[PDB]
Design a protein around this ligand. Sequence first.
Ligand SMILES: OC[C@H]1O[C@H](O[C@H]2[C@H](O)[C@@H](O)[C@@H](O)O[C@@H]2CO)[C@H](O)[C@@H](O)[C@@H]1O
Length: 553
Amino acid sequence: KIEEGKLVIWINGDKGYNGLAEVGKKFEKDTGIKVTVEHPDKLEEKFPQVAATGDGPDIIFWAHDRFGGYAQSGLLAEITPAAAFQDKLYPFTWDAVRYNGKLIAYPIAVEALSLIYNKDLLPNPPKTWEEIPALDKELKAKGKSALMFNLQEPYFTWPLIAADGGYAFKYAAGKYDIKDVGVDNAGAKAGLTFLVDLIKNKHMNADTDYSIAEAAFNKGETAMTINGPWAWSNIDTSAVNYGVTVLPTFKGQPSKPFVGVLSAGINAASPNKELAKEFLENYLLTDEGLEAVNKDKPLGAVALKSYEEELAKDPRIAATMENAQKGEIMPNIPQMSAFWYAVRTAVINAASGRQTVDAALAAAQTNAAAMSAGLDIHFRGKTKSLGSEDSRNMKEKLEDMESVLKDLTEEKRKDVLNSLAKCLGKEDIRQDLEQRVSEVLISGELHMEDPDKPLLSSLFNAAGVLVEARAKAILDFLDALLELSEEQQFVAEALEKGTLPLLKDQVKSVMEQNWDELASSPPDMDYDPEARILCALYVVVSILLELAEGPTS
Ligand SMILES: OC[C@H]1O[C@H](O[C@H]2[C@H](O)[C@@H](O)[C@@H](O)O[C@@H]2CO)[C@H](O)[C@@H](O)[C@@H]1O
């Protein structure tokens, strides 16, 4: 379901979609090709699901951080711009859309969060974050609020977290370390802890989201908000006289917002690649086209040199660039999905009081690291010289495995878990145990008990007959556990601290977005992407969670 000779474009709702459609219409008029511009919800999550089937839009507009993940799954076409054309755009923007040396998207614009303030309610904005609690006390007296911004998305929360020294992935030498995730460090704790206090002292509300905060600032009910260029259009149509400035400092350090480069990527499934190329290069990425989009809802500082020269005279763009400078540009790697999901949970849970700050962030680190290790794929291989024609869907396999382990004595369950837990990280222990359980399934062992056979005992029912289903369930778990390398250590961390349910939830969200649908034909050895591993991870986690039933370790 793609469509030849027609362009379908997906872009986020807060951006200038109407303005982009205006560009679309100018394309239709000249070239005679129909351009539809849609703005699905959960757009970034929907695309990889749809694109994996072969369906989906021809062009996708998102910030560059998602694109490496898309590229690794093979859902983006490599772009081939002319060297002459590349010279029209700033070179750093190209770097944002370069994954493993291939260009994978057209950079459109640079966006970064800036502090937006109402000049009437407050003539002089606060240079520090630590001033804000005081001013809220003051503005509460006039019936107003000091600060409201979106707390649901970590994009907005992050600059504060990153200020004193939070980071996503350590970037030393010039290359990212996936195993080193900086959400559990002191600076991150400090930053988040502060944010939580503002909610704890009724200066902000945990329930606040994009709609509420935007509404409140534009109705004049609050003195400040934190937001990107796109937001300015709706404030302009509003009555408010506003300014755009640098974000407040925390612990005498600047807020470090993550910086996105809004980028357009061409679906690998699309037959309209040359159409898309022409549309982006010659129609969108021109002074005329960008102006159309920008006029609807501002892009920020565009990638196009010619048009940026015009825009840079604006004071609001200068404010945006000062913030972008103080912050860091987002990595485009696949692991960013993992990072973001982890932090999203942590922040919401610490704000809602569901977990302590130190706990939420300590989980986020484990889960981010586990996951990020899962998406690696590079330098993954085997060593060797029965095998198992497993014939079964993976969603089915788990359904069966969980069903067998459900029907077990609480004492046997505990015995299984302890024996499986010892395998995490130790390949010899996992190898030994697979041979043992295979010996029982072939031969005969019988009721009894031991210091490592408490498991083998649990394969037998309450009459001392063997349940074959139990043994294979264990073998299937161990076969899955083999696929896992570095993240085994983190699965063990999760089991220990009791954060498997969070990990599972997270694995489930990045498995594109289904499970039922991310399982069809049984392993043909012709597939094998991030999929094979994430499945194993999901299995290993789900089983350990099932066995750590309810609330136990
Ligand atoms: O909240 C995590 C989210 O942040 C970024 O998405 C931004 C992006 O710069 C814009 O598209 C704008 O609409 O705000 C979004 C946040 O609401 C990342 O691009 C994205 O990966 C991440 O999920």
